[PDB]
Design a protein around this ligand. Structure first.
Ligand SMILES: [Mg+2]
Ligand SMILES: [Mg+2]
Ligand SMILES: [Mg+2]
Ligand SMILES: [Mg+2]
Ligand SMILES: [Mg+2]
Ligand SMILES: [Mg+2]
Ligand SMILES: [Mg+2]
Ligand SMILES: [Mg+2]
Ligand SMILES: [Mg+2]
Ligand SMILES: [Mg+2]
Ligand SMILES: [Mg+2]
Ligand SMILES: [Mg+2]
Ligand SMILES: [Mg+2]
Ligand SMILES: [Mg+2]
Ligand SMILES: [Mg+2]
Ligand SMILES: [Mg+2]
Ligand SMILES: [Mg+2]
Ligand SMILES: [Mg+2]
Ligand SMILES: [Mg+2]
Ligand SMILES: [Mg+2]
Ligand SMILES: [Mg+2]
Ligand SMILES: [Mg+2]
Ligand SMILES: [Mg+2]
Ligand SMILES: [Mg+2]
Ligand SMILES: [Mg+2]
Ligand SMILES: [Mg+2]
Ligand SMILES: [Mg+2]
Ligand SMILES: [Mg+2]
Ligand SMILES: [Mg+2]
Ligand SMILES: [Mg+2]
Ligand SMILES: [Mg+2]
Ligand SMILES: [Mg+2]
Ligand SMILES: [Mg+2]
Ligand SMILES: [Mg+2]
Ligand SMILES: [Mg+2]
Ligand SMILES: [Mg+2]
Ligand SMILES: [Mg+2]
Ligand SMILES: [Mg+2]
Ligand SMILES: [Mg+2]
Ligand SMILES: [Mg+2]
Ligand SMILES: [Mg+2]
Ligand SMILES: [Mg+2]
Ligand SMILES: [Mg+2]
Ligand SMILES: [Mg+2]
Ligand SMILES: [Mg+2]
Ligand SMILES: [Mg+2]
Ligand SMILES: [Mg+2]
Ligand SMILES: [Mg+2]
Ligand SMILES: [Mg+2]
Ligand SMILES: [Mg+2]
Ligand SMILES: [Mg+2]
Ligand SMILES: [Mg+2]
Ligand SMILES: [Mg+2]
Ligand SMILES: [Mg+2]
Ligand SMILES: [Mg+2]
Ligand SMILES: [Mg+2]
Ligand SMILES: [Mg+2]
Ligand SMILES: [Mg+2]
Ligand SMILES: [Mg+2]
Ligand SMILES: [Mg+2]
Ligand SMILES: [Mg+2]
Ligand SMILES: [Mg+2]
Ligand SMILES: [Mg+2]
Ligand SMILES: [Mg+2]
Ligand SMILES: [Mg+2]
Ligand SMILES: [Mg+2]
Ligand SMILES: [Mg+2]
Ligand SMILES: [Mg+2]
Ligand SMILES: [Mg+2]
Ligand SMILES: [Mg+2]
Ligand SMILES: [Mg+2]
Ligand SMILES: [Mg+2]
Ligand SMILES: [Mg+2]
Ligand SMILES: [Mg+2]
Ligand SMILES: [Mg+2]
Ligand SMILES: [Mg+2]
Ligand SMILES: [Mg+2]
Ligand SMILES: [Mg+2]
Ligand SMILES: [Mg+2]
Ligand SMILES: [Mg+2]
Ligand SMILES: [Mg+2]
Ligand SMILES: [Mg+2]
Ligand SMILES: [Mg+2]
Ligand SMILES: [Mg+2]
Ligand SMILES: [Mg+2]
Ligand SMILES: [Mg+2]
Ligand SMILES: [Mg+2]
Ligand SMILES: [Mg+2]
Ligand SMILES: [Mg+2]
Ligand SMILES: [Mg+2]
Ligand SMILES: [Mg+2]
Ligand SMILES: [Mg+2]
Ligand SMILES: [Mg+2]
Ligand SMILES: [Mg+2]
Ligand SMILES: [Mg+2]
Ligand SMILES: [Mg+2]
Ligand SMILES: [Mg+2]
Ligand SMILES: [Mg+2]
Ligand SMILES: [Mg+2]
Ligand SMILES: [Mg+2]
Ligand SMILES: [Mg+2]
Ligand SMILES: [Mg+2]
Ligand SMILES: [Mg+2]
Ligand SMILES: [Mg+2]
Ligand SMILES: [Mg+2]
Ligand SMILES: [Mg+2]
Ligand SMILES: [Mg+2]
Ligand SMILES: [Mg+2]
Ligand SMILES: [Mg+2]
Ligand SMILES: [Mg+2]
Ligand SMILES: [Mg+2]
Ligand SMILES: [Mg+2]
Ligand SMILES: [Mg+2]
Ligand SMILES: [Mg+2]
Ligand SMILES: [Mg+2]
Ligand SMILES: [Mg+2]
Ligand SMILES: [Mg+2]
Ligand SMILES: [Mg+2]
Ligand SMILES: [Mg+2]
Ligand SMILES: [Mg+2]
Ligand SMILES: [Mg+2]
Ligand SMILES: [Zn+2]
Lengths: 13, 204, 174, 37, 140
RNA sequence: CGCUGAAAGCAUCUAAGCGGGAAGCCCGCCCCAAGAUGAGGCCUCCCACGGCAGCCGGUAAGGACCCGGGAAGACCA
RNA sequence: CGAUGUCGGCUCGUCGCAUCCUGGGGCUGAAGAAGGUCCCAAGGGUUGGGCUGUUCGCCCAUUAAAGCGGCACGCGAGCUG
RNA sequence: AAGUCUGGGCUAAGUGGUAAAGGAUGUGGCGCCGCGAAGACAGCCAGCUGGUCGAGUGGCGCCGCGCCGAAAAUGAUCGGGGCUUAAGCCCAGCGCCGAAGCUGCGGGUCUGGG
């Protein structure tokens, strides 16, 4: 259930 | 089946056997029959009742014709009772004796555009702990790509009240025929001054 | 090894009329119609009724035996008439008659009152025997079962509503 | 009632009957009553 | 020479007793009548078929166990809104719907096909209200 | 779970037929609803206009506009 | 891969039925009461707390019961983080 | 679009129109023994024999087609309607429909021969 994220959680430009 | 038209007048409690009993007071009589619906002519059975006297200065000609064929003074409200056919030319509160149970129909108070909390008793959002401008919002409204849509009948904000409501099986606490008054135990839909219908109950 | 082709003795003096898909049986105790397959042929002989089939395939064979017994049962019904007897076993348990009606006092908090349908007659000799009597055999059989259902035979005690001649097979208590 | 894919005769008094499209096995011994399913 | 196309003609009214007929087999013919494919000057893009009046629709007959097993269906748009109604019950409550649905399912889809279905007049009971147009009895 | 009952002289709730049997199913209760274009029904009102299934024009019964408001309401209604 | 935002919670449901409860059954090594076991049934219901980010799990106090799953491990252009 | 075509047969589950071990007096067709007008199986009256009944009966196997076994998540459905001596399945036919394939007619271009 606690799988690893695949996207980095968004930084601002 | 039997019924009457009426106006909601207001609420009180009276005393009966060392008990306080909440009542709504209803002015029901007198309602003249202005038309009878017959199975040969209409295909069902009913009685058209008139209620509250009207200034003939405000009644147009097609309406005037209808009343005259019944030989009835111009009235403000017309409404039918289904499967009820009184022997007389006039229906009064006396069709109800105290102890009888009745069904009352009125027009609920109108809340206009109602939020999802007031309307559907949603829990809304948290008020602290990070809640972001969603304190009275409804949350999710669906799934994802399956079904990729929102159900018909999804409870959502929108108008609320000002709609037909019937509350059932109310005790008739007293009736004061000399004032065309009915005393019903408990609450009745709508505002004071509101038009209401009083029918013999359908519960057993 | 056959039933349909076995002829049907007809007592004096019951009449058996024949129609497409039905035979009417009148007698000293009433009338009864018997629905019959139009494929089957009923035959009015002297002092006798016979049923004939039109082939020896499975469905016709099945109807044949049934049709003969159906009419045979009708014949006996209007002459001798039918009955079934119920025994009542159990200490508090008794039955009585209230008009045409049958009243079972059989262990509930209340008594149960059974109404006899058309063509059925109730009887109470002892307070523990009940005779269901009528000219319709399936009807007598039914109503009887109905009565018995009110308080079926216990599994542990010789107690309840019993068919006449039904055995009292019980199980032990711990 | 036992409900199985294998309904068999259990004793010499069992009887494979078929009613309403279903194979039952009825018998004098209540334990032996079976429906196929 | 170009293919003959018909100018509008007076459409024929027709009457059919459905008593004891086999639901689907009667339907087939009703559809054909509606499409006018029995007419030598048949044209696929106009209504030139007949008007079909049917009586005794309650007395339509059907084979097998379909009285109990055939299921008519209605989705309402709402969750759990699939209603199922068996043949038996439909006949007891809206018997003309039985034939109507059958014929409807066998007409083309689209604006013309819907117009054709409108020229079907089905009634339970032996009588119909269209004596005025004096429909011609058909044996099918 | 039965009644009656053959095929299969017995038996069998079934193959003809008939009963009993769920908070479940259909109806019943409350609400919406004829755009139900399959556009339903009943009561009442107006009426046969002037000019060359159309058109322009003044009207009838009635409607709207405007206004005082409203436990109706975002505007609209 | 010129982006299909990823656990848990909150909110809002909806569906399945291999049914936790309530309803109807058959068998019981079913005396009664209470259970067991299978069958029918998805209408409704299915609590509040302690611990941990937890889902899960243990635990406290209750309950008719404290069901299991699907919906992008339902739901971040709804919130949290 | 063209057969509610013709002839023989099976299936009663809507099987056809989603699956296995395995289970079954489902139905039809073959075969094999056993018992029996010296009276058999069933029913009923005694002790595997006996008595009245008067015909068949009882088991084994092969083949066709069906039955159960068969629970999953938005609304169902064989594509749909609808189909039961068929509008299903097996065997045998005759006829039609059907493509930008083939033919008829006209044309273009290239290549080869006149
Ligand atoms: Mg971003
Ligand atoms: Mg009426
Ligand atoms: Mg009526
Ligand atoms: Mg009445
Ligand atoms: Mg009103
Ligand atoms: Mg607010
Ligand atoms: Mg509020
Ligand atoms: Mg509210
Ligand atoms: Mg809250
Ligand atoms: Mg709050
Ligand atoms: Mg909360
Ligand atoms: Mg909270
Ligand atoms: Mg923030
Ligand atoms: Mg912020
Ligand atoms: Mg805030
Ligand atoms: Mg939200
Ligand atoms: Mg998402
Ligand atoms: Mg979708
Ligand atoms: Mg409103
Ligand atoms: Mg009402
Ligand atoms: Mg009460
Ligand atoms: Mg009360
Ligand atoms: Mg014989
Ligand atoms: Mg014979
Ligand atoms: Mg019995
Ligand atoms: Mg086994
Ligand atoms: Mg054995
Ligand atoms: Mg059944
Ligand atoms: Mg037995
Ligand atoms: Mg047919
Ligand atoms: Mg036909
Ligand atoms: Mg034709
Ligand atoms: Mg037929
Ligand atoms: Mg049928
Ligand atoms: Mg939905
Ligand atoms: Mg629903
Ligand atoms: Mg479902
Ligand atoms: Mg629905
Ligand atoms: Mg198309
Ligand atoms: Mg029995
Ligand atoms: Mg019997
Ligand atoms: Mg018998
Ligand atoms: Mg017998
Ligand atoms: Mg049957
Ligand atoms: Mg059958
Ligand atoms: Mg029944
Ligand atoms: Mg019973
Ligand atoms: Mg309840
Ligand atoms: Mg209304
Ligand atoms: Mg309308
Ligand atoms: Mg309306
Ligand atoms: Mg119209
Ligand atoms: Mg429509
Ligand atoms: Mg109208
Ligand atoms: Mg009407
Ligand atoms: Mg005029
Ligand atoms: Mg003119
Ligand atoms: Mg004008
Ligand atoms: Mg205003
Ligand atoms: Mg308001
Ligand atoms: Mg205003
Ligand atoms: Mg305005
Ligand atoms: Mg990628
Ligand atoms: Mg892109
Ligand atoms: Mg992008
Ligand atoms: Mg994107
Ligand atoms: Mg939490
Ligand atoms: Mg749920
Ligand atoms: Mg289940
Ligand atoms: Mg299971
Ligand atoms: Mg229970
Ligand atoms: Mg339960
Ligand atoms: Mg139980
Ligand atoms: Mg017990
Ligand atoms: Mg015990
Ligand atoms: Mg015990
Ligand atoms: Mg137990
Ligand atoms: Mg088990
Ligand atoms: Mg149990
Ligand atoms: Mg449920
Ligand atoms: Mg559901
Ligand atoms: Mg659920
Ligand atoms: Mg909690
Ligand atoms: Mg703490
Ligand atoms: Mg916690
Ligand atoms: Mg936890
Ligand atoms: Mg776990
Ligand atoms: Mg853990
Ligand atoms: Mg631990
Ligand atoms: Mg309990
Ligand atoms: Mg808990
Ligand atoms: Mg658990
Ligand atoms: Mg769950
Ligand atoms: Mg869920
Ligand atoms: Mg997953
Ligand atoms: Mg999931
Ligand atoms: Mg989850
Ligand atoms: Mg998720
Ligand atoms: Mg979950
Ligand atoms: Mg989202
Ligand atoms: Mg977010
Ligand atoms: Mg999240
Ligand atoms: Mg999105
Ligand atoms: Mg043919
Ligand atoms: Mg089946
Ligand atoms: Mg199918
Ligand atoms: Mg299937
Ligand atoms: Mg197999
Ligand atoms: Mg076989
Ligand atoms: Mg065989
Ligand atoms: Mg013998
Ligand atoms: Mg099946
Ligand atoms: Mg399922
Ligand atoms: Mg199921
Ligand atoms: Mg799914
Ligand atoms: Mg096709
Ligand atoms: Mg053939
Ligand atoms: Mg070519
Ligand atoms: Mg050429
Ligand atoms: Mg070339
Ligand atoms: Mg050359
Ligand atoms: Zn056994």
């Amino acid at each position: 259930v606690d799988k690893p994220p695949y996207l980095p959680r968004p930084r601002p430009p | 089946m039997k019924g009457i038209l009426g106006v909601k007048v207001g609420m009180t409690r009276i005393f009966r056997d060392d008990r306080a009993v909440p009542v709504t007071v209803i002015l029901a009589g007198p309602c003249p029959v202005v038309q009878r619906r017959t199975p040969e002519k209409d295909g069902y059975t009913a009685v058209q009742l008139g209620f509250l006297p009207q200034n003939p200065k405000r009644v147009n000609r097609p309406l005037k014709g209808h009343f005259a064929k019944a030989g009835v003074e111009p009235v403000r409200i017309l409404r039918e009772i289904r499967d009820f056919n009184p022997e007389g030319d006039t229906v009064t509160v006396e069709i109800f004796k105290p102890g009888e149970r009745v069904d009352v129909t009125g027009t609920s108070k109108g809340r206009g555009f109602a939020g999802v909390m007031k309307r559907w008793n949603f829990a809304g959002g948290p008020d602290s702990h990070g809640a972001h401008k969603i304190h009275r919002h409804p949350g999710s409204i669906g799934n994802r790509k399956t079904p990729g849509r929102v159900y018909k009948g999804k409870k959502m904000a929108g108008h609320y009240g000002a709609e037909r409501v019937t509350v059932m099986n109310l005790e008739v606490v007293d009736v004061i025929p000399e004032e065309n008054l009915l005393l019903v135990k408990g609450a009745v839909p709508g505002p004071n001054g509101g038009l209401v219908i009083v029918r013999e109950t359908k519960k057993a | 090894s056959r039933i349909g082709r076995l002829p049907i003795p007809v007592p004096k003096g019951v009449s058996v009329e024949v129609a497409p898909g039905r035979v009417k049986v009148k007698g000293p105790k009433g009338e009864l119609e018997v629905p019959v397959s139009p494929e089957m042929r009923v035959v009015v002989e002297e002092g006798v009724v016979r049923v004939e089939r039109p082939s020896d395939e499975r469905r016709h064979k099945s109807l044949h035996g049934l049709t003969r017994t159906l009419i045979a049962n009708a014949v006996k019904g209007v002459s001798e008439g039918y009955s079934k007897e119920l025994l009542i076993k159990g200490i508090g348990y008794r039955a009585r008659l209230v008009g045409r009606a049958l009243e079972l006092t059989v262990g509930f908090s209340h008594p149960v009152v059974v109404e006899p349908p058309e063509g059925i007659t109730f009887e109470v000799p002892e307070p523990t025997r009940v005779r269901v009597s009528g000219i319709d055999k399936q009807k007598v059989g039914q109503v009887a079962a109905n009565i018995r259902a009110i308080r079926k035979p216990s599994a542990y005690h010789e107690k309840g509503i019993y068919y006449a001649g039904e055995p009292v097979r019980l199980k032990p208590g711990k | 009632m036992k409900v199985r894919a294998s309904v068999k005769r259990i004793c010499d008094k069992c009887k494979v009957i078929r009613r309403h499209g279903r194979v039952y096995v009825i018998c004098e011994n209540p334990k032996h009553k079976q429906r196929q399913g | 020479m170009k293919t003959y196309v018909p100018k509008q003609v007076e459409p024929r009214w027709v009457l059919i007793d459905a008593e004891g007929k086999t639901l689907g087999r009667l339907a087939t013919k009703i559809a054909t009548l509606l499409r006018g494919k029995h007419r030598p000057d048949w044209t696929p893009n106009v209504a030139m078929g007949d008007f079909v009046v049917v009586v005794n629709a309650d007395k339509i007959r059907v084979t097998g166990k379909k009285l109990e097993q055939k299921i008519y269906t209605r989705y309402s748009g709402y969750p759990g809104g699939l209603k199922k109604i068996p043949l038996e019950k439909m006949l007891a409550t809206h018997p003309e719907r039985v034939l109507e649905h059958a014929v409807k399912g066998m007409l083309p889809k689209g604006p013309l096909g819907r117009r054709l279905f409108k020229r079907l007049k089905v009634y339970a009971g032996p009588d119909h209200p269209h004596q005025a147009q004096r429909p011609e009895k058909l044996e099918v």
